[PDB]
Design a binder for these strands. Structure first.
Length: 207
DNA sequence: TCATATCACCTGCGTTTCCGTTAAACTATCGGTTGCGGCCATATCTACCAGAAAGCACCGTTTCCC
């Protein structure tokens, strides 16, 4: 419970309001990869923040590799500004984080068979083609990947607090699977997602 | 470089289920052609009928007879 989870990847999307010519967009970006022989879209990485991004002719975009809530909106706004420099209106709309990926380490090894046998209502553990166990948390809804080393991965979340709540909910379970710190201090010590996102310009006129 | 989880996608392959196709035995009329019979025309035979010249009966004035 003392080893607070770290975010590894935040993935988001934004609507542009207007349908646009993706070939025209592909002409001016300083990083771009695109070939209709394999896929009909441009892959578009940037230096700072270190995000990858994607654009669709229908007037929608996706952003990946964000380290913070801030990076997600700030990168999306900078990609939209590049499209506004180009011959399109690109009205920044529908900003959302569809998935969050985080990880933590309890520093003790886990008997995945014991976890799967006792919590089989939520746990799945297939024959060992892959070494890690998977867990389906239903309230709040989170997917957790459990490894024998004590390393843990969390995904399927969209709100920051639920990743820390899911870790805190399974830490007592993991701690029971032991043989021969445990205090969270608070459920969420850091500021909320909204108090982070509000540092970035929200108004679409603030290009 | 293979072995899991999760999401945007969109475009693509070629899949996967009830309907459509070529053509069946058995089905429901309905048509090109078969044979079978009414109305109406004709020359002849007939039923129902009246009219004439002639019958014939009811009747009583006559007169001969009770």
């Amino acid at each position: 419970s003392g080893i607070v989870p770290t975010l590894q990847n935040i993935v988001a999307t934004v609507t542009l309001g207007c349908r646009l010519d993706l070939k025209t967009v592909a002409l001016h970006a300083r990083n771009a990869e695109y070939n209709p022989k394999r896929f009909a879209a441009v892959i578009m990485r940037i230096r700072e923040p270190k995000t990858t991004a994607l654009i669709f002719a229908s007037g929608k975009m996706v952003v990946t590799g964000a380290k913070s809530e801030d990076d997600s909106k700030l990168a999306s706004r900078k990609y939209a500004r590049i499209i506004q420099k180009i011959g399109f209106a690109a009205k920044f709309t529908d900003f959302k984080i569809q998935n969050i990926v985080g990880s933590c380490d309890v520093k003790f090894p886990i008997r995945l068979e014991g976890l799967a046998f006792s919590h089989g209502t939520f746990s799945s553990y297939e024959p060992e083609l892959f070494p890690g166990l998977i867990y389906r948390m239903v309230k709040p809804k989170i997917v957790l990947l459990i490894f024998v080393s004590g390393k843990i991965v969390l995904t399927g979340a969209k709100q920051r607090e639920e990743i820390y709540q899911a870790f805190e909910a399974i830490y007592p379970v993991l701690s029971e699977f032991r043989k021969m710190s445990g205090s969270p201090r608070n459920l969420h010590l850091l500021p909320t997602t909204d108090t982070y996102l509000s540092k970035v310009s929200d108004d679409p006129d603030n290009l």
